Design an enzyme around this catalytic site. Structure first.
Site: not given
Ligand SMILES: OC[C@H]1O[C@@H](O)[C@H](O)[C@@H](O)[C@@H]1O
Length: 477
Positions: A18, A166, A307, A309, A378, A428, A436
């Site tokens: 990335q 990941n 991770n 979100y 993340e 993150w 992506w």
């Protein structure tokens, strides 16, 4: 109510493809993402990880940025195809690639920053995919992954925090159910010439678990005795609330969703079996571990890498789900029966902020898995229309300041009020970067990167907010 232990690790996270650029420099071989991006229509803005943030050449500036922001930790990934350009155990090793990362880690340590190193963050060397279908060949993949891992364990003994994979959920579902991510397999022959959306995802998840557990056993047997440190997998997964808070089937479906998304991987790792809810729905499409595999996989996390979100409302479905179904016979929604919302939109269609869900999920996972040590590897957000804003507005990213404020305090309450053993938090991301299939349009950075002016870095308000936030939370002694 909210207080974190004195050793608490915090900082930022990135991934090689990335941010690094230099995709053909110093011997690097192509990854499955280099190939995927060459296919018209797969990346929303027609871009690729070519150039990105040019971080491969800007390590010194990126380290000085981390130090300026007060981070005590930094998570990054190793590009396998820089270490073994074709990927395999009989292929030539690229010493320039090794020396790059060994030096990077020496320099991080010299700046006082703890490295957290992800071995695999989606950039599978293309040759492995072409030779044997990558993750689809259990024995070949596990052998080549273990070999790669041992090379890194040996070369970077100063790293004490190792992550195997990941977000294997992404690799399996987005890579082999929908074809949204490399290598783009799906049943849908208008998007891919190969794949089977009903079968390949579950094979891919299975075989990643095996490979992970081989790498863990190698670490524990041959390296941990003399180098110390710890190793685990990083799993993503979003929180759930019932679409109809009165309906017991939605309440049950909130657990089931999490079981299909996370326990797919975590139940094997902690208990040596898949979730019963998955076995029931998928039957013989879900592989079975042998007794040797159970012994290998069970107990294979030193810590839980998380991770996280967002959250969704969950609405149960009745009847038999389609064979391509991966959610667990349910629907995810952003609005509930009474019109209540998860949160406002961001630039990512799938991401609405809901800090309470982070606390809820920390609890759910801690309870199911016996209060493991958790590193949050993340958490962060995009901001709608951020790519179109003028600089002055981008740097004033109050929405993102707020996301980190609410999510970090929610986590601190999980610790101090709910007893969850969280020991690190990695934001993150350090830099706006290649997101992506969405390309560069979706910005997750606490630092603006001006791609039109040589990837020049401008810290946003969020970047500077984290240090004083954690100063308010982390006990001195
Ligand atoms: O429908 C599948 C979608 O699920 C979301 O949670 C993923 O993060 C998206 O990236 C994906 O396209």
């Amino acid at each position: 109510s909210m207080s974190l232990p004195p050793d608490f690790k915090w900082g930022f996270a990135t991934a090689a493809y990335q941010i690094e650029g230099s995709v053909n420099e110093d011997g690097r071989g192509p990854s499955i993402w280099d190939t995927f991006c060459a296919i018209p229509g797969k990346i929303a803005d027609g871009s690729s990880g070519a150039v990105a943030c040019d971080s491969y050449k800007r390590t010194k500036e990126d380290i000085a940025l981390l130090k300026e922001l007060g981070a005590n930790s930094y998570r990054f990934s190793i590009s396998w195809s820089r270490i073994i350009p074709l990927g395999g155990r009989n292929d030539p090793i690229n010493q320039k690639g090794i020396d790059h990362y060994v030096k990077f880690v020496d320099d991080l340590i010299e700046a006082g920053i703890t490295p957290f190193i992800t071995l695999f963050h989606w950039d599978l060397p293309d040759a492995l995919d072409k030779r044997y279908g990558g993750f689809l060949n259990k024995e070949e993949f596990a052998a080549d992954f273990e070999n790669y891992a041992r090379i890194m364990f040996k070369a970077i003994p100063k790293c004490k925090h190792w992550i195997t994979f990941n977000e294997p959920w992404c690799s399996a579902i987005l890579g082999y159910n929908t074809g949204y991510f490399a290598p783009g397999h799906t049943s849908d022959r208008s998007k891919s010439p190969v794949g089977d959306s009903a079968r390949e995802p579950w094979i891919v998840g299975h075989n990643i678990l095996i490979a992970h557990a081989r790498a863990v056993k190698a670490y524990r047997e041959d390296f941990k005795p003399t180098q110390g440190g710890e190793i685990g997998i990083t799993l993503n997964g979003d929180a759930t609330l019932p679409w109809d808070p009165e309906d017991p089937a939605d309440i049950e479906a909130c657990d089931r969703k999490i079981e299909f998304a996370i326990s797919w991987f975590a139940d094997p790792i902690y208990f040596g079996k898949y979730p019963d809810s998955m076995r029931k729905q998928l039957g013989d499409r879900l592989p079975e571990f042998t007794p040797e595999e159970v012994a290998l996989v069970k107990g294979s996390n030193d810590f839980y890498g998380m991770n996280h979100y967002t959250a969704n409302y969950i609405k149960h479905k009745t009847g038999v789900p389609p064979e391509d179904d991966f959610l667990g016979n349910l629907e995810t929604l952003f609005y509930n029966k009474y019109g209540d919302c998860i949160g406002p939109e961001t630039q990512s269609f799938w991401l609405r902020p809901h800090a309470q869900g982070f606390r809820d999920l920390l609890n759910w996972l801690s309870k199911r898995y016996g209060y493991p040590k958790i590193y949050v590897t993340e958490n962060g957000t995009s901001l709608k229309g951020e790519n179109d804003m003028p600089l002055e507005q981008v740097l004033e990213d109050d929405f993102r300041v707020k996301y980190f404020n609410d999510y970090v305090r929610a986590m601190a309450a999980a610790v101090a009020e709910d007893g969850c053993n969280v020991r690190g938090y990695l934001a993150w991301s350090l830099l706006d970067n290649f997101e992506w299939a969405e390309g560069y349009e979706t910005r997750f950075g606490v630092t603006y990167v001006d791609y039109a002016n040589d990837q020049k870095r401008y810290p946003k308000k969020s970047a500077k907010s984290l240090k004083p936030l954690f100063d308010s939370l982390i006990r001195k002694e």
